[PDB]
């Protein structure tokens, strides 16, 4: 779409200063999620601990002792009452943060999948979309715990998930370089997204809701649509010879936050695919990344047990 | 203001301390992981422990706690979850000596010995387990010596020609598995004979993980 958008260009160099660095973890971080309040964020690490961090004061609200230390995903519900954590054990132990007691008690465990749990996202306090490593996704409940709708259309292992602003339809990419826009009402994909060549690792929706970014392990990102489904731009560059572990957008959908696994993050232009900023400072490969719904700061997580906040 | 934020920081600093011992309790214990292809003979290593998703086993021996993980049945490719175990003490391997004659029941064209050897190189030569030691076990040594007096053993390796004796082949295939590794300057490979007879080989893996944690302690001191 470079022939369109003649009015815009890379806005100098986006210099996001490191404001907060969350300390306390002792293992490799693998997942995180934000909320609308933009003050409490969940984070999962390989030490078997689920921490509810305070964004403004770098304090730990809750410390959930996980039963399985090999957790690979974690979600934060918009209500702020429940948080999920899936991993190799395939037991999505959804805990209850706001409880009458002091310790965090588990609300419902989800042990119906067979492949490794890769990503989970809370639709609401009743429905949750959780992917797995058996080339399928499923919609789960909390009060009873079952699979309302199982999406079986991918030939590769799912890696990441992403929810739309209305949470009625979601895209999801797999290791077979194939993404599909699944529906929550009827429960089946409408059109697939096959534009990459390597294992898709990260998926994130566009703030408008008519597009989404895709991050594969071939050192490039792409932006697909939901109406005509044709690739508009490619975030390819010869300076990147590494993989991709995370991708996200800002509040305005202009600065794409691409968490490349080369120890540094990259702030890409979501309209011209130009390098606008490079977030460096992480001592290890990043695995998770999330932008607040408010848009104030951006939290990046690496395997160095450090969660850096950029603003 | 320090009105209620002091109690919030005190609560955070309270679980900051609690999470510190939990990291130390997990650091003093040995974390092991075992791999293997179909019919890997892992029933031996999981039986010596005092006791969908993977199986995990706890067992304490010689005043030392071990955290062994059983992969079991994982249809997913290892490329997307083998980097999670980056940091284990010593990854365990279980190769079956009876895999030289029997072929895999997948395409009728791949030998089980070559398939297990292809999995040994895929696990060893990676960007995650460069430093972690490998402890491979030769399971079913009595079943292997019973078939070697009837088979020329050339089925797996056609370029080999030697003695059809257990002590000869157990040492020959030991050096063979010690040639597919390229990180001979960083990691260490252990080999032992496991079976139902002459059991209780945990003294070997206990001395093996003791060698690794000391090598890790030497890295803590800054001597390597």
């Amino acid at each position: 779409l470079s022939q369109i958008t003649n009015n815009i260009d890379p806005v100098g160099r986006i210099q996001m200063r490191t404001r907060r660095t969350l300390r306390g973890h002792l293992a490799k971080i693998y997942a995180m999620h934000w909320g609308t309040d933009s003050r409490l964020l969940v984070s999962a690490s390989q030490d078997g601990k689920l921490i509810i961090w305070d964004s403004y004061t770098t304090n730990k609200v809750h410390a959930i002792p996980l039963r399985s230390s090999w957790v690979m995903t974690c979600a934060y519900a918009p209500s702020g009452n429940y948080v999920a954590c899936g991993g190799l054990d395939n037991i999505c132990s959804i805990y209850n943060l706001k409880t009458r007691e002091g310790n965090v008690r588990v609300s419902r465990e989800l042990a119906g999948h067979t492949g490794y749990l890769s990503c989970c996202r809370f639709l609401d306090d009743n429905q949750i979309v959780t992917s797995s490593g058996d080339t399928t996704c499923a919609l789960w409940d909390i009060e009873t715990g079952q699979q309302t709708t199982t999406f079986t259309g991918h030939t590769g292992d799912v890696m990441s998930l992403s929810l739309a602003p209305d949470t009625r339809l979601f895209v999801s990419g797999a290791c077979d370089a194939s993404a599909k826009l699944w529906d929550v009402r009827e429960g089946m994909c409408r059109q697939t997204f096959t534009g990459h060549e390597s294992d898709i690792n990260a998926i994130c929706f566009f703030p408008n809701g008519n597009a989404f970014a895709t991050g594969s392990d071939d050192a490039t990102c792409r932006l697909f649509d939901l109406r005509a489904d044709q690739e508009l731009m490619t975030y390819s560059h010869d300076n990147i010879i590494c993989g991709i572990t995370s991708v996200s957008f800002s509040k305005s959908g202009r600065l794409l936050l691409a968490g490349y696994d080369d120890f540094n993050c990259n702030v890409w232009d979501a309209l011209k695919a130009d390098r606008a900023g490079v977030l460096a400072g992480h001592d290890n490969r990043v695995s998770c990344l999330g932008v607040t719904d408010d848009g104030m700061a951006v939290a990046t997580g690496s395997w160095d047990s450090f969660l850096k906040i950029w603003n | 203001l320090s009105a209620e934020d002091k109690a919030a920081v005190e609560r955070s600093k309270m679980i900051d301390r609690n999470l510190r011992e939990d990291g130390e309790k997990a650091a003093r214990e040995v974390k092991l992981l075992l791999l293997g292809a179909g019919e890997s003979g892992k029933c031996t290593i999981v039986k010596q422990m005092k006791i969908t998703g993977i199986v995990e086993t706890h067992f304490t021996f010689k005043d030392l706690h071990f955290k062994m993980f059983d992969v079991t049945a994982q249809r997913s490719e290892r490329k997307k979850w083998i980097h999670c175990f980056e940091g284990v003490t010593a990854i365990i391997f279980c190769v079956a000596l009876s895999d030289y004659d029997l072929v895999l029941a997948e395409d009728e064209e791949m030998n089980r010995m070559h398939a297990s050897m292809k999995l040994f190189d895929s696990i060893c030569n990676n960007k995650w387990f460069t430093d972690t030691s490998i402890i491979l076990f030769l399971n079913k040594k009595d079943l292997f010596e019973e078939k070697i007096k009837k088979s020329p053993l050339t089925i797996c390796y056609p370029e080999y020609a030697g003695s059809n004796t257990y002590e000869e082949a157990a040492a020959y295939i030991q050096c063979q598995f010690e040639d597919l590794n390229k990180r001979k300057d960083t990691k260490e490979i252990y080999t032992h004979f496991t079976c139902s007879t002459d059991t209780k080989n945990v003294q070997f893996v206990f001395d093996a993980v003791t060698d690794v944690i000391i090598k890790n302690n030497l890295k803590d001191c800054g001597l390597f």
């Epitope: 809750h62 007691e101 002091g102 | 109690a7 005190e10 309270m14």
Partner: single-chain antibody
Framework: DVQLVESGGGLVQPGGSRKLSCSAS????????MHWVRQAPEKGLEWVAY????????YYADTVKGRFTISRDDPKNTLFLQMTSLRSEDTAMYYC??????????????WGQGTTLTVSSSDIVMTQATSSVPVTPGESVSISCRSS???????????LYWFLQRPGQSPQLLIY???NLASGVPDRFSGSGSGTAFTLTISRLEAEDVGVYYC?????????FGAGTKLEL
């Protein structure tokens, strides 16, 4: 089921000690800040002592500083309050309150039954400018409260807590942070205010809203409660 029962039933003679006990059940006693609130017959509440998780921060009120001693037992889930050098002003109920401190938390949720002990005969002043409002159900009721210091902080929230005490029962939280209702309270209590003046409006009053109202601040120690707005039918 959260439960806070106290023991030590009996009047004390001036010149000794009582050292009452308080056990907990239904919740993690180790991860809650225990508070002590006194209330003489038809009098305003008053904070006495507060201990945090792990006996780290132990604060006392100037009325009890140097006289009373608090000691908790995490393995026992029992709170021991050693009270020595007692006098006639120590006659109260000695409520035990639990509280956890974090963003979005609900401090002062559950109140203990208390032990009505009798004896053989600067700080932020919270004023309500009203002690009794006899109003039958049928119209809305609004209760205000003032403060000696502005409760508006730099982070944004206003630390204010409302407590309703029914005759023969223990108080319980109404609205924390001056705009957020606690768990188990219907959307009838709407808290408003700015800095010093505050307002608690009740759209429809029932038999559950008839009681004494207290406006407590959590800025500085010792904590001070309101004057007490009693309702009549």
């Amino acid at each position: 089921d959260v439960q806070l029962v106290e023991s030590g039933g009996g009047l004390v003679q001036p010149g000794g000690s009582r050292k009452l006990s308080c056990s907990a059940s239904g919740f993690a006693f180790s991860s809650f800040g225990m508070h002590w609130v006194r209330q003489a017959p038809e009098k305003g509440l008053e904070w006495v002592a507060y201990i945090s998780s792990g006996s780290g921060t132990i604060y006392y009120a100037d009325t009890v500083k140097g006289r009373f001693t608090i000691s908790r037992d995490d393995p026992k889930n029992t709170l021991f309050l050693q009270m020595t050098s007692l006098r006639s002003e120590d006659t109260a109920m000695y409520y035990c309150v639990r509280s956890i401190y974090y963003y979005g938390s609900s401090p002062f949720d559950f109140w203990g039954q208390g032990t009505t002990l009798t004896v053989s005969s600067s700080d932020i002043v919270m004023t309500q400018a009203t002690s009794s409002v006899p109003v039958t159900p049928g119209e809305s009721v609004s209760i205000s409260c003032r403060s000696s210091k502005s409760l508006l902080h730099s982070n944004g929230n206003t630390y204010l807590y409302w407590f309703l005490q029914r005759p023969g029962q223990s108080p319980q939280l109404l609205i924390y942070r001056m705009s957020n209702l606690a768990s188990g309270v219907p959307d009838r209590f709407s808290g408003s205010g700015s800095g010093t003046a505050f307002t608690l409006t009740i759209s429809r009053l029932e038999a559950e809203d008839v009681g004494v109202y207290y406006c407590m601040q959590h800025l500085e120690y010792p904590l001070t409660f309101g004057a007490g707005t009693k309702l009549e039918l």
